[PDB]
Specification:
part of a larger assembly, 3 chains, A: mainly beta, 4-stranded antiparallel β-sheet, about 20% strand, B: two-stranded parallel ribbon, 22 helices, 6 strands, Spike protein S1 (chain C), metal ion binding (chain B)
């Protein structure tokens, strides 16, 4: 088990931002530093709780014996993802950065995949010094920089005083080149053969004073206190008596609002999904789109939409995406032809009546209509085509194909070795799944140079009152306060 | 250009049009199973007449295509199924006389009535006769009834059987086949495949070797049956000799289910009777169907369609609209299936429900195939798979798993022997007779025998093969084994024989691959995804490919297997071996009960 | 930038928690079929990037190894790890880490 004590870090956790020597310089830099006098939760483990790795978790330890190893960083730290380990032993680094499931401490359960490994020297730097309570001061900085996981170190001995107010400089060390993501962090204490200070480093400017020997003897924050900000602006550790203009204050925008016209175009998208007298597959309908509304709810909620597969454009990131014209074609097939509808595939209907090209962008939608386009004793209104010379070209109509011929012999009508391609399509309300009349529409996306006026609801949001917000009135982007006016707008 | 493309186009057109017309005619047939009204039956006969006319017209169009210029195996199978013309190969007069004689056969078999010495009792065909047979053991009564029925039916049928053999070998010549037996065997014709082609005489060799390997075991079981009969009639059976024909067990010599009260080894202990358990639980036919679907899901078969539970009749809708409830359930086409039962809450109704559930599942499996191959690879696959479903339901292990049987039940050797004897004697009594008539039809239509060597050889062969002696000698003008409903309209018993052997093979392979332990019998095949996929990979094929490849996938061998007969009755046979020391072995052909 | 999000998790459409493929539940990735049958815009281009950090760190890779003996107290041009420049190089008494 472990405790949940809360303390103050004071001034601590200052590292070298770069690898350039500075002597007697007051160089000022902004990076992921530990804010001065920032409260750090200190756990005393005699366990191993979870900690979110947000913006550079910092660590420290003031133990009395070697009990703490195993730094892990990953999303949820388990569940088949890359979580890594920095478990150490007093021979070498014992880096165990791989993909695991459970380790509890090398010591692991499932090998899975793996990545960068490296051993050169004990990463914990297990030296006892002189006194028993050398505390093996475990100052390190772990942070993510464009995927370059950085690690620092400083083994400055302390005497009893945990989180001491004495200054220290964290020298850099090796860094992990793994381009992975990190969300949480836990310390996997080692297995047998005053230890925790998670000072999260929020980004903030820091003023650092270098010795004549290049060591960082002292530093001051730039946003902790007004005096610290004044010193930061003056680039000196001493300020004379007087008034100093440090920075500027603004009220940050509480909320962001987006406004747009009434979005009232009223495309008959519901009307093209309920026109009862549909057209068969041999003569598929076609519509032209312009100045419409891209209300995709009907595509999403109306009808069971048995078919929703598409390969060109995601049907999720589509409400805001906006074109001008869409080629939608409506026809009725059975269950299996709905599946056979695809780009670059075989299938009698798809090969002889309506072919989807390989470069087709769009989403094919089919739902179940078992009682609308069907009736008892027979539904012979629906037709289809079955024969042609070869593979049909995409987006092609072959109405009035006369009579199909074979055998290299002249034929006059429906007779021997010459039949009518329009074979009967019998529809009854008692077909089982695979032969039930299924209504499918194929609507295609084209990256059109024409003005795209069908863009969706435009995300109209209520606009507060008397509050500093980011407004987007009819595309007017800006930040300010909003209030009722007494203007005389024309 | 090439005839293959023309055959393909026709085949597509024929398949579409004939699937539409077959859906219409199957709707008519289902409404025939449901209603019996005159307007209904007029619609049904007009629909079937138009379907027959369409089929004949398409066959006439397809007669143009040749036979040599086809290379695809599926196209070859489609051509073989299509080229079957039947009665259309003859002339109009021959067709009209054939249909007239079929009508005469149907009328005489439907209206056949035999009069006892008292004319007040009119034995109306099989109903009544079967009840008297089952509930009475009167030698004089049953023998007189059978003798009169034979002396009438065979006397009327003798010249028409010669007419039939002549006409049927003429049809065989029209099909360019050696005989009508070979014409039937054309359903087992494999051509165009190396190391995979099997001709018609291969089946004759297979039945010969099966007879060779079943002769001793059949002799043993027949000896046990005749000993059981002797224990109830001591002066009516010759133990060293064969058993008379009128003592097979039933009215036609077909079934042996009647020999149940005097044949059970331990009649004192009751058999597996769960009927009381579902009477306690108040089970329903719909819930029994749901349990069958759950079992089929355990064997990984696809779920039944919603239309199956929506449209299909399940329970009787009153008594004014009477329904026939013979066990049969065929698809309507385009993925529609329905079922008809006279269901109650018993064991046999559940057994036939599982049988037709296997039927419907097999029918659904091949639904992606075209119309000409929309059938089993033989004429008994659906019946065989229904039987294996029923046997899977019959095992008490399935009852224990389902919970209908109380868990505190102990399996006993005598109970196992009783169940195996019942489920054996119900089917195996038909096995000697089915080939006893099938081989005789084969040889008669062969043309290798004269006219006046039929009845004597009939009786002598059945005695010397199974132990079936004629009690009342008859001359060559009789047709005693031709008084069955199945032979009324020239239906082969090849389907029954292949059903009996194939269902065995299926269940033996399934139990072998189901990691079972102990005796193969009394073992269910459920909750086994591997074996379910093993079923499905051949169920989805159907008529498209010959049975041999599916057989090698299911079991591992290419020819017919003889092991199931031996290894399906192993406890019965092991128990009988020790008792055989006190029972005489063998039969004498020359001994007949009326030679005094 | 420079991020790997390898994961096969169902991306639902709308608000339903559907898992699998088909109705309003989508796989995160789709087909990348490559054939010689498409056009130049879909030909399988095999590209590789090269990323460097030109920052003040001890260089690990240096290209063609050319080294001239270092001289001191003289006006010379230095190219220490790409640090092009000119000046007089004298040894120093600093405390370089």
């Amino acid at each position: 088990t472990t405790t949940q004590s809360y303390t103050n870090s004071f001034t601590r956790g200052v590292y070298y931002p770069d690898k350039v020597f500075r002597s007697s310089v007051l160089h000022l830099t902004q990076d992921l530093f530990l804010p001065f006098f920032s409260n750090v939760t200190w756990f005393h483990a005699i366990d191993n709780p979870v900690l979110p790795f947000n913006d550079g978790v910092y660590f420290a330890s003031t133990e009395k014996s070697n009990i703490i190893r195993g730094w892990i960083f990953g999303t949820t730290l388990d569940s088949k993802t890359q979580s890594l380990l920095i478990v150490n032993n007093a021979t070498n680094v014992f880096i165990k950065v791989c993909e695991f499931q459970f380790c509890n401490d090398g010591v692991y359960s499932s090998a899975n995949n793996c990545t960068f490994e490296y051993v050169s020297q004990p990463f914990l730097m297990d030296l006892e010094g002189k006194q028993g309570n050398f505390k093996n001061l475990r100052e390190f900085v772990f942070k993510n920089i464009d995927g370059y996981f950085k690690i620092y170190s400083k083994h400055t001995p302390i005497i009893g005083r945990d989180f001491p107010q004495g200054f220290s400089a964290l020298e850099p060390l090796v860094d992990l080149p793994i381009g992975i993501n990190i969300t949480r962090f836990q310390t996997l204490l080692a297995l047998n053969r005053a230890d925790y200070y998670v000072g999260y480093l929020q980004p903030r400017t820091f003023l650092l004073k270098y010795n004549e020997n290049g060591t960082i003897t002292d530093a001051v924050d730039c946003a902790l206190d007004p005096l610290s900000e004044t010193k930061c602006t003056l680039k000196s550790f001493t300020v004379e008596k007087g008034i100093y203009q440090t920075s500027n204050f603004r009220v940050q925008p509480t909320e962001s609002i987006v406004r747009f016209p009434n979005v009232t175009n009223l495309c008959p998208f519901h009307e093209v999904f309920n026109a009862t007298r549909f057209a068969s597959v041999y003569a598929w309908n076609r519509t032209r789109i312009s100045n419409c509304v891209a209300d995709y709810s009907v595509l999403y909620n109306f009808a069971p939409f048995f078919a929703f597969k598409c390969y060109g454009v995601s049907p999720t990131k589509l409400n805001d995406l906006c074109f001008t014209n869409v080629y939608a074609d409506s026809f009725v097939i059975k269950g299996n032809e709905v599946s056979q509808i695809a780009p670059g595939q075989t299938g009698n209907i798809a090969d002889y009546n309506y072919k989807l090209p390989d470069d087709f962008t769009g989403c094919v939608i089919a739902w179940n209509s078992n009682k609308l386009d069907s009736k008892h004793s027979g539904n012979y209104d629906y037709w289809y085509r079955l024969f042609r010379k070869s593979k049909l070209k995409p987006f092609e109509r072959d109405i009035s194909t006369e009579i199909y011929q074979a055998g290299n012999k002249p034929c006059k009508g429906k007779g021997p070795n010459c039949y009518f391609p329009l074979q009967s399509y019998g529809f009854r309300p008692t077909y089982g799944v695979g032969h039930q009349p299924y209504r499918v529409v194929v609507l295609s996306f084209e990256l059109l140079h024409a003005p795209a006026t069908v863009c969706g609801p435009k995300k109209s949001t209520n606009l507060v009152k008397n509050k500093c917000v980011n407004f987007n009135f009819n595309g007017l982007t800006g930040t300010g306060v909003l209030t009722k006016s007494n203007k005389k707008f024309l | 250009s090439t005839t293959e493309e023309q055959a393909k186009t026709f085949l597509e057109k024929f398949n579409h049009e004939a699937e539409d017309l077959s859906y219409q005619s199957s709707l008519a047939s289902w409404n025939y199973n449901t209603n019996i009204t005159d307007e209904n039956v007029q619609k049904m006969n007009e629909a079937r007449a138009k379907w027959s006319a369409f089929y004949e017209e398409q066959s006439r169009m397809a007669k143009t295509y040749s036979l040599e210029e086809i290379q695809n195996l599926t196209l070859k199978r489609q051509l073989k199924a299509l080229q079957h013309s039947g009665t259309s190969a003859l002339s109009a007069e021959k067709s009209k006389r054939l249909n007239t004689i079929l009508n005469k056969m149907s009328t005489i078999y439907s209206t056949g009535k035999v009069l006892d010495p008292n004319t007040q009792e009119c034995l109306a065909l099989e109903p009544g006769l079967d009840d008297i047979m089952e509930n009475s053991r009167d030698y004089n009564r049953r023998l007189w009834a059978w003798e009169g029925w034979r002396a009438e039916v065979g006397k009327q049928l003798r010249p028409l059987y010669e007419e039939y053999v002549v006409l049927e070998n003429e049809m065989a010549r029209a099909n360019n086949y050696e005989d009508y037996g070979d014409y039937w065997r054309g359903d087992y014709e494999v051509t165009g495949a190396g190391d995979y082609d099997y001709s018609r005489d291969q089946l004759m060799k297979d039945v010969e070797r099966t007879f060779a390997e079943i002769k001793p075991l059949y002799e043993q079981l027949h000896a046990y049956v005749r000993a059981k009969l002797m224990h109830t009639y001591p002066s009516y059976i010759s133990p060293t000799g064969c058993l008379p024909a009128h003592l097979l067990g039933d009215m036609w010599g077909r079934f042996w289910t009647n020999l149940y009260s005097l044949t059970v080894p331990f009649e004192h202990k009751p058999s597996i009777d769960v009927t009381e358990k579902m009477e306690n639980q108040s089970w329903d036919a719909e819930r029994i169907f749901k349990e069958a679907e759950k079992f089929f899901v355990s064997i990984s078969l696809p779920y039944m369609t919603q239309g199956f539970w929506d449209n299909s009749m399940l329970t009787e809708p009153g008594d004014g609209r009477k329904v026939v409830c013979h066990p049969t359930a065929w698809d309507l086409g385009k993925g529609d299936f329905r079922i008809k039962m006279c269901t109650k809450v018993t064991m046999d109704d559940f057994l036939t429900a599982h049988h037709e559930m296997g039927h419907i599942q097999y029918d659904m499996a091949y639904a992606a195939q075209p119309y000409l191959l929309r059938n089993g690879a033989n004429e008994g696959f659906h019946e065989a798979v229904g039987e294996i479903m029923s046997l899977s339901a019959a095992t008490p292990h399935y009852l224990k798993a389902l919970g209908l049987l109380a868990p505190d039940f102990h399996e006993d050797n005598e109970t196992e022997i009783n169940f195996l004897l019942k489920q054996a004697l119900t089917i195996v009594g038909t096995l000697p007779f089915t080939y006893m008539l099938e081989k005789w039809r084969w040889m008669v239509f062969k043309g290798e025998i004269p006219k006046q060597q039929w009845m004597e050889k009939w009786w002598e062969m059945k005695r010397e093969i199974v132990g079936v002696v004629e009690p009342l000698p008859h001359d060559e003008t009789y047709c005693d084994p031709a008084c069955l409903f199945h032979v009324a309209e020239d239906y082969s018993f090849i389907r029954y024989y292949t059903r009996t052997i194939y269902q065995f093979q299926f269940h033996e392979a399934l139990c072998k691959t189901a990691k079972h332990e102990g005796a193969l019998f009394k073992c269910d095949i459920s909750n086994s995804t591997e074996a379910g996929q093993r079923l499905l990979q051949m169920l989805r094929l159907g008529k498209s490919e010959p049975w041999t490849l599916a057989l090698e996938n299911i079991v591992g061998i290419k020819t017919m297997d003889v092991k199931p007969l031996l290894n399906y009755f192993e406890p019965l046979f092991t128990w009988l071996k020790e008792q055989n020391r006190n029972s005489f072995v063998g039969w004498s052909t020359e001994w007949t009960p009326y030679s005094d």
